[PDB]
Symmetry: C2
Subunit: 146 residues, 2 copies
């Protein structure tokens, strides 16, 4: 038929994985974490775990510590899972979508963004689940995990 | 995390039943979508279904050219799905099946017919996959990522 046989056979493995997390607990966030860390473990590829502090003082440092703690806990669990290279990616900005698209993706250079279907940030310019928005707008592959 | 939570967070996640959604166009995103789905199905030994949704003839549109146009489009999409199935078998996927459906609302066909029948836990599609015949215009992947009850990867 019409497709190039050899090219269509080449394996595809994602080389640099970015997991985006919020502070909430739910089945989608658990499964997004497990997918990203299973992939990174099984194919021996780097994982970045990102969250974003939203622009609004012992209060601001407490909010910052909270985001840092959420990401640090996920990194610890990823290390326990056996992922060889995992790093925290805590970023700050006005609109989370732009922070991810304009700062995190270009700096960390992932080829896959993973996030749970429930992940959301209350002061994002567009309200609601960030995963499908990123699936539409990002220049890389995006999986929205449920 | 408490002990139970820690253990649950550690449990491997390997998708069990993969649904690849395709249109007739051969582009970078569709090639990579096919390669990701078949690499997953091969490396983890899980079933793959390869789906598309055909346009049907409209009983209120009667003319000499429309039937040929629609029939030839249907056969083209059937050919593309069959070729993807053969390529997946050549790739070494043990269980791969065609899933050709039809209807005017492709989102609804996938959500209400294909997913409940094939029972995938992951839907894969290229970022360019689109069905201009359908109710809603533009790339279907991000809409399915929003609406589906299962995980959806939009591949670029
Ligand atoms: Mg291990
Ligand atoms: Mg069956």
């Amino acid at each position: 038929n019409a497709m190039e046989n050899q090219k269509m056979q080449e394996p595809l493995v994602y080389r640099r994985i970015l997991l985006t997390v919020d502070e909430d607990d739910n089945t989608s966030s658990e499964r997004a974490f497990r997918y990203a860390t299973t992939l990174a473990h099984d194919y021996d590829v780097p994982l970045g775990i990102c969250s974003v502090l939203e622009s609004e003082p012992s209060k601001i440092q407490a909010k910052r510590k909270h985001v840092e703690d959420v990401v640090a806990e996920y990194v610890q669990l990823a290390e326990q899972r056996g992922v060889n290279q995992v790093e925290p990616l805590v970023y700050e900005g006005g609109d989370v979508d732009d922070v991810i698209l304009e700062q995190v993706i270009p700096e960390f250079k992932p080829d896959l963004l993973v996030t749970g279907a429930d992940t959301e940030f209350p002061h994002s310019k567009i309200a609601g689940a960030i995963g499908p928005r990123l699936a539409r707008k990002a220049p890389i592959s995006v999986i929205v995990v449920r």
